[PDB]
Ligand binder design. Structure first.
Ligand SMILES: [Mg+2]
Ligand SMILES: [Mg+2]
Ligand SMILES: [Mg+2]
Lengths: 160, 160
């Protein structure tokens, strides 16, 4: 398969949220979340920790040379947070590029289209999570859509 | 003086625009611009060129362990152009953090107010240029404000 590290990047600004990742190593899919929440750190300081956490994973599973598929950062609710998130998303890419074999921005609409995930924001979150829960890679309780999106990005990229 | 590498980052989408840089190495101030303009490329590829250009400079002048002072990205013209510039700015920082000993964002308003620079964008450019031209470091007729702004960021930082 194409060696892909899929990332759904988040600065973990709210408790319980984090950067979603997914990759395949010898047939086996690994998924998880980097839960870097800390109210005494800025978005950029928490992004530093997320980079270090993904470098640690890249080392543990020998992922050097995997291509980075990362969800496109877009304009959110408020302007200023979206620019912050855009800058932090960039920092994250720049810090691991070279360890990874370049990167591709994956628009949310494109990976949703491939999986036939259509509907409004809430509906798409549920459907993405359903697809992840159907695989058994996480507990049936799981409500972490950051992980689900990273997993659905991976499978889309493997198809391409 | 702290060993500061001052950067005024731009993707050079327009002819003549460049990423400006200024630093002090063995007591001599060096200033210049990375003229990355290339209609053949996206802002991201041009950003990658700029990273590699600054990487060459850090090597040539043995600048490892210098601290990065980089102008903050602000929300300007278009929503897309804002996310794009903010994203490429973050890429540049992430790509060179480690070669540099960390970084600090320098708001346009703070270095400008330190140097008594104010007005509309065009007015600020002329005053930024006057400070650079007054040093004698560049030719008399220099109109490269990207360079002027990086130099003024350097002296603002050195002052701290
Ligand atoms: Mg996302
Ligand atoms: Mg500037
Ligand atoms: Mg005035």
């Amino acid at each position: 398969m194409k060696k892909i590290l899929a990332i759904n990047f988040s600065t973990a600004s709210k408790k319980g949220e984090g950067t979603g990742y997914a990759f395949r190593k010898d047939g086996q899919v690994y998924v998880g979340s980097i839960k870097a929440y800390n109210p005494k750190k800025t978005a950029w300081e928490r992004t530093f920790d997320i980079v270090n956490a993904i470098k640690d994973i890249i080392d543990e599973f020998d992922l050097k040379g995997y291509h980075l598929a990362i969800e496109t950062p877009i304009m959110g609710r408020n302007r200023k947070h979206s620019i912050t998130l855009a800058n932090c998303n960039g920092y994250f890419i720049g810090a691991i590029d070279g360890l990874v074999n370049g990167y591709t921005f994956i628009d949310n609409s494109k990976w949703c289209s491939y999986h036939l995930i259509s509907g409004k924001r809430e509906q798409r979150k549920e459907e993405s999570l359903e697809l992840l829960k159907a695989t058994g890679l996480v507990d049936s309780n799981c409500k972490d859509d950051n992980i689900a999106d990273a997993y659905n990005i991976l499978t889309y990229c493997e198809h391409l």
